[PDB]
């Protein structure tokens, strides 16, 4: 719910707060409010596997955090663009059908 | 965020739950999770007119809660139907710009 809520909320705001600030003391809370509603998400689901490695480019390079993973989502969701390449994949079609369409829901979800 | 959630998800497992059960161990506690989902909802946002509304007519006729409002909320929403009558509102454009807007956006929303 809330994941999605921040997702939604944080597309507009983004622009703005980046080009706006402090002339817009809307967006700028808005983001911050956004980013604590994230915090509430991942609190229960776990960190995905870049987030760990771009723990570890920042580490070695002394690259911040934050955009060193934001240098690594699009090739990795290329990771999870698969139809379904059951090679090493576990327990499949248990409880998480496809991804894709989990990303396709995004998409329409944001109307993307 | 979970109040939509809650929305989106019921509208597939009341059908299903109501006409199966307990055949059906999958809607079943899908619902009981959504209901608790709008508990955690309506925990901070408080009730509407019709809610209170409700609690009378149970009041005088015996009638139990959950179907009383449920017979209610139709005319209510007709009610919140309104472009701009500035009659009796109070504050109107400053944090709820309109409600049909609002309702707008749940009916996409759930794509409908």
């Given amino acids: 719910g809330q994941a999605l809520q921040a997702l939604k909320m944080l597309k507009e705001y983004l622009p ?6 402090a002339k817009d003391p809307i967006a700028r809370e808005k983001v911050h409010n956004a980013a604590t509603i994230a915090g509430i ?9 870049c987030h760990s490695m771009a723990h570890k480019i920042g580490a070695e390079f ?5 955009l060193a993973n934001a240098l690594l989502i699009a090739n990795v969701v290329r990771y999870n663009a698969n139809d379904n ?4 994949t576990a327990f499949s079609q ?3 059908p ?6 396709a ?8």
């Fill in 62 to 66: 002394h690259l911040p955090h934050g």
């Fill in 41 to 49: 998400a991942f609190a229960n689901a776990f960190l995905g596997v």
């Fill in 105 to 112: 829901e995004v998409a329409d979800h944001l109307g993307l």
């Fill in 16 to 21: 703005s707060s980046y080009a706006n600030g």
């Fill in 85 to 88: 390449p059951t090679k090493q």
């Fill in 98 to 103: 496809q991804a894709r369409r989990r990303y």
């Fill in 94 to 96: 248990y409880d998480r």
